[PDB]
Design a binder for this molecule. Structure first.
Ligand code: FK5
Ligand code: CA
Ligand code: CA
Ligand code: CA
Ligand code: CA
Ligand code: FE
Lengths: 15, 107, 795
């Protein structure tokens, strides 16, 4: 998504 | 280029005119003699009218100079036949046609 | 925060499963439609197929892996998946955006002023992959902390080695916003605006005014509508027997008369700028009498009855209509759709014949609907995510104490944006099914005696085919499965390969002449001569060609060879070679009745037939006659029969030689003369026949390969022994259906020779060159409708 976390996702990481 | 070489003469007095219907049996072949169509196999003759542009020009011209009951062979070059376009499924393109034409009846 | 995550985990996993299932099913069905239905390939629909790929590679690989993450509460995979899955999503998004842009540009070209399509597909995929490469080579795995519990995370490394990757990480968001969301919408809006302006200023009055003048002139009663009588008012149309069908097709609303709008719409079907699909749809609707969208048996029969007239019988026309329906029904519903119709008559190029001078549009509804639907779906699916991103970029501030509700809004919006982006890769089949008529019909067709005998139906438990079932089926115009026919022909060739060059046959024996594919006449022959169950048969050759049912004769004769290899004897004819079979109608027979592999198997079986027989130690049976190179039976016995019959040698002489015209009364002593009629082999004389008979101590010779009015002919009686030296047997009654001759069969039993005669039998009719009725009829339809439209409009 569009956050900082432990995931790969479209724009930024996900929680 | 239409040529009529006689196979068997007819009555020699009655010739097709504009307006009426010729009922005939025909058998066509390519230059190799392979049979591509023949109305005799159907056990029913084919009818066509003169002056309505229903058949190819060569066949109509050959029928014009061929008399009632006459049987002849017509040599039709592609300019008086299906030409370079041909007929899908029957006639290959730029083919010279040979027709065994027998005029049965005039109506 | 925590509650939202705990509640949305279940939602995310359900979304992942739903996208998995729907995407796989829909995209697989869409690709199946593209690659089985032959009409779909004509347009830009294959770009749609690429979109399906652009979804499928994403759905089966990236979705399940993420599912594990949704139940892992951490990041369990290594660098490989961390680098692979986001590469897949970026590649899929690039494929979708480039496909939409290229397709919109392509049809802007299409409606305004192919190898290029394949090159464009390749370019789209290459550009998508190369643009997604930096993203894949960007991520990494790092474990920093979680305030006590170290954990690994897949993300952009905070520091990048190269300056290019530092620039990439700095402004990745706007690169993803511009190329993947701004460029598609901008390009599609620009090209659609140009198309709107194109139909704006390209609109004129000249053609409309001229067509209105023609409409007013034709409208005798000035009622604003055209009835049957006003169309018949032109004398030139009184000789066209396709008038009423075209008048009905011009009438779209079914009120019985054509108004100006319907006049324009009907005329527009024949513009120089119209597509081939419009012409083919007009051709389909010509036969589609009741406009149900399907061609059935009855409607086609009536249409061709009106066209042909009384030239053909009812029974044969009905039979060939049933044949066309059977061959052209690719789904077994008993009726022909437009899809199957254009799969059949696609190559006739009759669409180019229906040309008139006019320019009007009735199209641009359907496909414009589809393309705008696809672009709108793409825009709406990545809209919530972009809105969430811009809201976080603008209003989010971690320093603000009033921040918890901002998290509660942004996280839910991000969840919605992720879920919708996931659903987009599984929504294109649904969108196409809802917007497009062609796609909906194709999906409906896919998801939702013509019987073919199988191996269990032909072969029993012992491997011996049941002759009665094959007999009845092939009598009833039935067909056979490819595997069964190939099996029969191949193992029949295997059986025949073991026989010697010269067969030793003892009395009683029945000998038959040329059959030439006359399956029903072959039936009459077997009936007259007695069933093969108790009668030995010697066929002299020519089982194919000159007929329309040769494959039936082949199947049944080698079937009896399967059942009765030792009581049934077959000899080669000259027509079982490459040259004669490709020259005559047998090749097209195999191509239409079966596949070319069946032709190859049939030819291989033909290659294995024996050549000659020795009957009752007194008689020699061949197909043609003697050779100048053959003096004793040993020459025949040493022949290599497993080859193409060469243009010269004892092979060609045995398969092609004929007696002289004046056999038995020839003027000279020349034994052999050149054969001009056949173009090969030689004419042989009565002195030569007597020489061969006396030298080899044979009494008479049986042959075929010459037409006989009575079906048989005994040549001159031999001086030394008093028996007819050469007997020709013909068993093809009504040869080529023009000879009207009889057929004869030769029975030898108890030193008694009896010739039995039989005549022709009815057989179903086939159009020349084994074509269907549509290929027969389409050019005539096109020419007459074009002549009508030229006589009406152009003047
Ligand atoms: C099914 C309904 C259609 C309708 C079919 C019938 C009434 C049955 C009728 C016995 C046709 C035969 O069907 C078994 C078969 O006869 C042939 O085998 C043939 O021996 C042939 O050459 N003939 C037939 C005898 C007259 C001369 C010539 C012909 O002028 O034929 C004409 C012909 C094809 C003209 C085309 C028309 C299209 C133009 O574009 C083209 O212009 C270049 C010229 C035929 C009579 C047409 O007027 C009428 C039809 O077509 C053709 C090789 C193919 C043709 O099947 C189509
Ligand atoms: Ca009117
Ligand atoms: Ca109307
Ligand atoms: Ca219908
Ligand atoms: Ca169907
Ligand atoms: Fe032969």
């Amino acid at each position: 998504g569009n956050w900082h976390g432990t995931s790969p996702d479209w724009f930024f990481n996900y929680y | 280029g239409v040529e009529i070489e006689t196979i068997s003469p007819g009555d020699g007095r009655t010739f097709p005119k504009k307006g009426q219907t010729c009922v005939v049996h025909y058998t066509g072949m390519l230059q190799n003699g392979k049979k591509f169509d023949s109305s005799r196999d159907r056990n029913k003759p084919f009818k066509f009218r003169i002056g309505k542009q229903e058949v190819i020009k060569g066949f109509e011209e050959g029928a014009a100079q061929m008399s009632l009951g006459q049987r002849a062979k017509l040599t039709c070059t592609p300019d008086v036949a299906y030409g370079a376009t041909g007929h899908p499924g029957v006639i290959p393109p730029n083919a010279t046609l040979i027709f065994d034409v027998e005029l049965l009846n005039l109506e | 925060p925590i509650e939202i995550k705990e509640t949305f985990k279940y939602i995310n996993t359900v979304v992942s499963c739903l996208v998995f299932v729907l995407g796989i099913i829909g995209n697989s069905t869409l690709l199946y439609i593209i690659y089985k239905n032959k009409c779909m390939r004509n347009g830009p629909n294959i770009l749609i197929a690429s979109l399906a790929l652009g979804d499928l590679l994403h759905i089966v690989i990236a979705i399940p892996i993420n599912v594990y993450k949704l139940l892992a509460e951490d990041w369990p995979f290594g660098a490989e998946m961390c680098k692979l899955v986001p590469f897949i999503q970026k590649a899929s998004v690039g494929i979708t955006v480039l496909s939409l842009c290229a397709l919109s540009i392509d049809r802007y070209r299409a409606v305004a002023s192919p190898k290029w399509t394949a090159v464009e597909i390749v370019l789209i995929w290459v550009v998508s992959v190369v643009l997604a490469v930096p993203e894949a080579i960007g991520f990494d795995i790092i474990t920093m902390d979680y305030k006590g519990s170290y954990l690994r995370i897949c993300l952009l490394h905070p520091v990048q080695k190269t300056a290019f990757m530092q620039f990439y990480a700095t402004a990745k968001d706007w690169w993803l916003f511009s190329f993947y969301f701004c460029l598609p919408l901008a390009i599609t809006a620009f090209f659609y605006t140009l198309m709107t302006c194109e139909m704006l200023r390209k609109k004129d009055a000249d053609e409309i005014k001229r067509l209105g003048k023609r409409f007013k002139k034709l409208d005798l009663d000035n009622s604003g509508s055209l009835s049957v009588e006003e169309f018949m008012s032109l004398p030139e149309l009184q000789q066209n027997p396709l008038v009423q069908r075209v008048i009905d097709i011009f009438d779209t609303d079914g009120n019985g008369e054509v108004d100006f709008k319907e006049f324009i719409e009907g005329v527009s079907q024949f513009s120089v700028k119209g597509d081939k699909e419009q012409k083919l749809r007009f051709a389909f609707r010509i036969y589609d009498m009741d406009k149900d969208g399907y061609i059935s048996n009855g409607e086609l029969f009536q249409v061709l009855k009106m066209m042909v007239g009384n030239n053909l019988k009812d029974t044969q026309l009905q039979q060939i209509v049933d044949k066309t329906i059977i061959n052209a029904d690719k789904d077994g519903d008993g009726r022909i759709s437009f899809e199957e119709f254009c799969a059949v008559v696609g190559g006739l190029d009759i669409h180019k014949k229906m040309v008139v001078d006019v320019d009007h549009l009735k199209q641009r509804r359907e496909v414009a609907k589809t393309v705008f639907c696809l672009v709108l779906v793409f825009a709406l699916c990545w809209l919530p995510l972009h809105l969430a991103r811009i809201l976080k970029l603008t209003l989010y501030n971690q320093n603000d104490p009033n921040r918890c509700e901002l998290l509660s809004f942004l996280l839910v919006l991000d969840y919605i944006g992720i879920n919708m982006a996931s659903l987009n890769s599984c929504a294109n089949p649904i969108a196409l099914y809802l917007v497009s008529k062609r796609f909906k019909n194709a999906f409906k067709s896919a998801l939702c005696p013509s019987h073919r005998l199988t191996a269990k139906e032909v072969f029993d438990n012992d491997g011996k085919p049941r002759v009665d079932i094959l007999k009845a089926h092939l009598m009833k115009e039935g067909r056979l499965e490819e595997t069964v026919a190939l099996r029969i022909i191949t193992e029949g060739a295997s059986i025949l390969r073991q026989e010697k060059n010269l067969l030793d046959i003892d009395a009683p024996v029945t000998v038959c002449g040329d059959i030439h594919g006359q399956f029903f006449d072959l039936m009459k022959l077997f009936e007259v001569g007695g069933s093969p169950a108790n009668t030995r048969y010697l066929f002299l050759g020519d089982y194919v060609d000159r007929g329309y049912f040769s494959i039936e004769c082949v199947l049944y004769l080698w079937a009896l060879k399967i059942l009765y290899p030792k009581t049934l004897f077959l000899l080669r004819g000259n027509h079982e070679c490459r040259h004669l079979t490709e020259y005559f109608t047998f090749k097209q027979e195999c191509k239409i009745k079966y596949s070319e592999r069946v032709y190859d198997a049939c030819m291989d079986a033909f290659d294995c037939l024996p050549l000659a027989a020795l009957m009752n130690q007194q008689f020699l049976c061949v197909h043609g006659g003697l050779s100048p190179e053959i003096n004793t039976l040993d020459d025949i016995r040493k022949l290599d029969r497993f080859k193409e019959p060469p243009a010269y040698g004892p092979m060609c002489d045995i398969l092609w030689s004929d007696p002289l015209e004046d056999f038995g009364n020839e003027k000279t002593q020349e034994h052999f003369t050149h054969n001009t009629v056949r173009g090969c082999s030689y004419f042989y004389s009565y002195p030569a026949v007597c020489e061969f008979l006396q030298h080899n101590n044979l009494l008479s010779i049986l042959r075929a390969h010459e037409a006989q009015d009575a079906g048989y002919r005994m040549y001159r009686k031999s001086q030394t022994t008093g028996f007819p030296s050469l007997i020709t047997i013909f068993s093809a009654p009504n040869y080529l259906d023009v000879y009207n001759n009889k057929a004869a069969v030769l029975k030898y039993e108890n030193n008694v020779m009896n010739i039995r005669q039989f005549n022709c039998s009815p057989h179903p009719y086939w159009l020349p060159n084994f074509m269907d009725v549509f290929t027969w009829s389409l050019p005539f339809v096109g020419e007459k409708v074009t002549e009508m439209l030229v006589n009406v409009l152009n003047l």
